[PDB]
Design a protein around this ligand. Structure first.
Ligand SMILES: O=C1CC[C@@H](C(=O)O)N1
Length: 149
């Protein structure tokens, strides 16, 4: 099993969230709301308006997302769902846990290591596209995700 930080179309309310809940693919259980500890550029790019976490830590913005506990069946599914390693790569990062209420002695941990689907090789100009802190297909940019061909 592993923890995966999702920031794009897999989040609750987003167009591919269903694939986490299709038990043919294994299990995924929501653990927490999170925010990356380091900033990355998160951009909407290409004809399908897909979101890409560019692997440029230390630039961009802190990225909001959701932490899921997944089994190995679900992780293998997701790796193929994301066309890894050719398109995205599964890398690791640390995420700040966001609680419903601000914070006891000893205090609760506030970070966790997760896998994430990031992209290392891209048209360089993508790095100058608008940077997002929270992706929404139906967000104010108007660039709706569309898997059509
Ligand atoms: O659309 C996307 C980007 C990577 C994955 C996610 O939600 O994290 N799906």
């Amino acid at each position: 099993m592993a923890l995966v930080f999702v920031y794009g179309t897999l989040k609750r309310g987003q167009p591919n969230h269903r694939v986490l809940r299709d038990g043919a693919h294994g299990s995924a259980a929501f653990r927490a709301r999170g925010r990356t500890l380091e900033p990355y550029p998160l951009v909407i790019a290409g004809e399908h308006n897909i979101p890409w976490l560019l692997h440029l830590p230390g630039s961009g913005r802190l990225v909001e997302g959701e932490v899921y506990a997944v089994d190995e069946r679900m992780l293998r599914f997701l790796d193929d769902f994301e066309s890894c390693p050719a398109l995205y790569q599964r890398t690791v990062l640390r995420v700040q846990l966001l609680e419903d209420r601000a914070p006891e002695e000893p205090p609760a941990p506030t970070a966790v290591q997760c896998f994430v689907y990031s992209r290392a090789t891209f048209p360089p100009e993508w790095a100058q596209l608008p940077h997002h802190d929270s992706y929404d297909s139906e967000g104010p940019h108007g660039l709706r995700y569309n898997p059509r061909e």
